[PDB]
Amino acid sequence: AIIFLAXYKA
Amino acid sequence: AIIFLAXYKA
Amino acid sequence: AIIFLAXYKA
Amino acid sequence: AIIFLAXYKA
Ligand SMILES: [Cl-]
Ligand SMILES: [Cl-]
Ligand SMILES: [Zn+2]
Ligand SMILES: [Zn+2]
Ligand SMILES: [Zn+2]
Ligand SMILES: [Zn+2]
Prior knowledge:
4 copies of one chain form a homotetramer.
Chain A: no helix or strand
One chloride ion binds near residues 3 and 5 of chain C.
């Protein structure tokens, strides 16, 4: 998945 | 924390 | 993805 | 926050 937590890990 | 995964949980 | 942030969304 | 996405960033 695409995650923004402040920046693909899915 | 503020998280965007596609939207505060901290 | 599987996420735990405290709980599949991938 | 504590995050597990597979691993404290809060
Ligand atoms: Cl979550
Ligand atoms: Cl992570
Ligand atoms: Zn930033
Ligand atoms: Zn969206
Ligand atoms: Zn916090
Ligand atoms: Zn995925």
